[PDB]
Amino acid sequence: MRECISIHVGQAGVQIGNACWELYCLEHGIQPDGQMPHHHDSFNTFFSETGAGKHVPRAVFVDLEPTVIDEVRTGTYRQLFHPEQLITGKEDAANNYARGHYTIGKEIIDLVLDRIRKLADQCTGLQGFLVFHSFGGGTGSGFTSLLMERLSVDYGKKSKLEFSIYPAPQVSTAVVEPYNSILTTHTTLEHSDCAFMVDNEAIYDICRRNLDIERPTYTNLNRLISQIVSSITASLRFDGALNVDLTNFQTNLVPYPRIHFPLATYAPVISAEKAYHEQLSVAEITNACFEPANQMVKCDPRHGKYMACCLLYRGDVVPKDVNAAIATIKTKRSIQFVDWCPTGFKVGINYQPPTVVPGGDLAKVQRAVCMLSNTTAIAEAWARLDHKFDLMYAKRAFVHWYVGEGMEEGEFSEAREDMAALEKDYEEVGVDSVE
């Protein structure tokens, strides 16, 4: 009845989605091969149902290099996906925005849109698209910016949520990351509805102290990011005392058309041994999700102000102490709201407790909180990246790879002035308003 399809672009999107679809197949009790062993349907929103008992996901895996898709084709989730959905190219974008947006990615975009149309036409109550893509890659930052220009034309007004991977301040792999991120943000700033940011460095610290682990590989990080994604769409697939649909985030977290960059947060994240010595009440997991050491983006909310918030409880939660805990939080002077937002909280309660995958680092709990806050403190993240771009562009380093692959030197200047206006607007409206 209510359908939403997910698009995974690049290696970051495919690897994250490889762990996300392992979670949905477990919540709904779906075997890895598609068969079956709050519920009356549940899987109808994500799993299209075929003639037999097999369910296939509404996913479109796309990549330019073939070195990662064949891992999915060979791995344990081989019989699940529709073989025609997994689209692969010949050679990657090689961390180049021009290659994955002008020359190489243009020979595959027409095939991808054919699969999207063949998926949207089969469903009736399509809500919106979920895009899992990185920011520093070539096909995860230059090709996903080609999809929005095409999806926003075929489908006029639909919610288009994103789950990006912000480049961390210190820990970073690419060398031309400031070049790819600035160009992507300037182009996707008009064809996106709500872009959630997640940082790789912040999750390293969260998984180190709270979970008490020493070797957090990329499999551990992707297993934790997927929990936030499943928590957002928990009300679509399950009943609850106070439901929240996908369109609710658009009209509650986006005061202005350009300020649509919330940062996710999850709680509680505790190990198996630490779970026995904790009461795990509603009044403290709300406190745990508000501390500055539990945010999943490397920025401190104390420097900024909270424009809006959104808490999505689930499990054994009573709607009374939720109000009591939230009222206490506002009174505390550690957090502060903006003057023109007298009310800045949106709550949602679900009836399905979070599930735990076998062999997972997290332990089984009966309550969970996923907090998505749109705060001014993210303006310091744009300033840091805007400084890196201006440092390399002054000496015109690495430019010759972009110019000779289907771009002009004037495009780099336009993408710079746009980010200067967005940064200015993020503090002009966040400052006190006279009279």
Binding site: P66, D70, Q170, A174, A397, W401
Partner: protein, 429 residues
């Protein structure tokens, strides 16, 4: 998919290549007879990148071994592990270049360049999606430095949208293997600077010191020297041959390591390097791997990085590790050692991780740094070339086979121009 073509020119290229295909065959479990004998199925997932499927499940390497004299091909063909190459690829002349650039680029190399190019072209059509070329040669010889340059110019005229690498063995300051070294090296670099995407420069005594104080070897022959180079050569490609957490490829590196079209002379490296006796007293872990490869002692090109600044740096790890440990230390290395990193390139480190450890090791890596200390090598060669050119010594067997004085004076002004721009970016703010 994304297969590459291997071209070996000269004597050093044939000797390095003869040890290069020993490592690749062992990695993929390929018997010397040419038929697969391995156990794990991950090896055969991507075998077309280097090998070529033939009839009756036989694998033939995609290599083109060529040299002007027939002395070298006798050893590889008649010796062991010479039963798997295709006899068509064995291209050779009758008289060697005689350590002359003119005899390998105009006179004798012009006879063979039309026969090898008919095999390079044939190999490309059978290829599904060509990725690039690989050339191993020397900058001091006659055919490796003269004719290997000729192949570069002709290939670049037919496949402009391709990426090729040269694993040159640049001469050494302390000892000269040939008396007329600077004439050949200067004339080759003037051509390698125009038709090559990245070049890995390797010295010879810098490999002797590594084999002496680190590997603890008393009499290192050329068998134990080419084995150390081949490991570095096989570490760059392994990202696109095996699945990994953070993959890379040949084109991905060229974007990160080459800020400007002329600054593509790299300095490779390897780790861990330990003696056989003293391998039980060390814990194989990421924190010591990064510490070992970042010191001037363990570098395969005899140029101390302390005299310059790293423009960009790559680190292609292997084995199985944790992404947190890898990214935690390269921040510590950058923060603790911020003195020799360029300021106008924030975050000048590229890191990739594979999942298949090398044969007989828990983990390893490979270090590729586009440092500025390479400047001190081109300064020395241009100094030696100037001294000989003024007295016109040895010059009259280069003019007697096509070349002239005007050609020399343009191959040295270009060399000095590169040095000037290689230093103005070290002190640039």
């Amino acid at each position: 998919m994304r297969e590459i073509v291997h071209i070996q020119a000269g004597q050093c290229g044939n000797q390095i290549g003869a040890k290069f295909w020993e490592v690749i065959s062992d990695e993929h479990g390929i018997d010397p007879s040419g038929n697969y004998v391995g156990d794990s199925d991950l090896q055969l997932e991507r075998i077309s990148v280097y090998y070529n499927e033939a009839s009756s499940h036989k694998y033939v390497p995609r290599a083109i071994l060529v040299d002007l004299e027939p002395g070298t091909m006798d050893s590889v063909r008649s010796g062991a592990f010479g039963h798997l190459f295709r006899p068509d690829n064995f291209i050779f002349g009758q008289s060697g270049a005689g350590n002359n650039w003119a005899k390998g680029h105009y006179t004798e190399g012009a006879e063979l360049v039309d026969s090898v190019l008919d095999v390079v072209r044939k190999e490309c059509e059978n290829c599904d999606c060509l990725q690039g070329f690989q050339l191993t040669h020397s900058l001091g010889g006659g055919t490796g430095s003269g004719m290997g340059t000729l192949l570069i110019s002709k290939v670049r005229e037919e496949y402009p949208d391709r990426i090729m690498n040269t694993f040159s063995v640049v001469p050494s300051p302390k000892v000269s293997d040939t008396v007329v070294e600077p004439y050949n090296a200067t004339l080759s670099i003037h051509q390698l600077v125009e038709n090559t995407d990245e070049t890995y420069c390797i010295d010879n005594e810098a490999l002797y010191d590594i084999c002496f104080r680190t590997l603890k070897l008393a009499t290192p022959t050329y068998g134990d020297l080419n084995h150390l180079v081949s490991a570095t050569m096989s570490g760059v490609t392994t990202s696109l041959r095996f699945p990994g957490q953070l993959n890379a490829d040949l084109r991905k590196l060229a974007v990160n390591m080459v800020p400007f079209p002329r600054l593509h002379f790299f300095m490779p490296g390897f780790a861990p390097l330990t003696a056989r006796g003293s391998q039980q007293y060390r814990a194989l872990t990421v924190p010591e791997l990064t510490q070992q490869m970042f010191d001037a002692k363990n570098m395969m090109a005899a140029c101390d990085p302390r005299h310059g600044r790293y423009l960009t740096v790559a680190t292609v790890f292997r084995g199985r590790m944790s992404m947190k440990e890898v990214d935690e230390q390269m921040l510590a290395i950058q923060s603790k050692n911020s003195s020799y990193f360029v300021e106008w390139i924030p975050n000048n480190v590229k890191v990739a991780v594979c999942d298949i450890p090398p044969r007989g090791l828990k983990m390893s890596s490979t270090f590729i740094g586009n440092s500025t200390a390479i400047q001190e090598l081109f300064k020395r060669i241009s100094e030696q070339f100037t001294a000989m050119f003024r007295r016109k010594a040895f010059l009259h067997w280069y003019t007697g086979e096509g070349m002239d004085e005007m050609e020399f004076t343009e191959a040295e002004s270009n060399m000095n121009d590169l040095v000037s721009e290689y230093q103005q970016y070290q002190d640039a703010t």
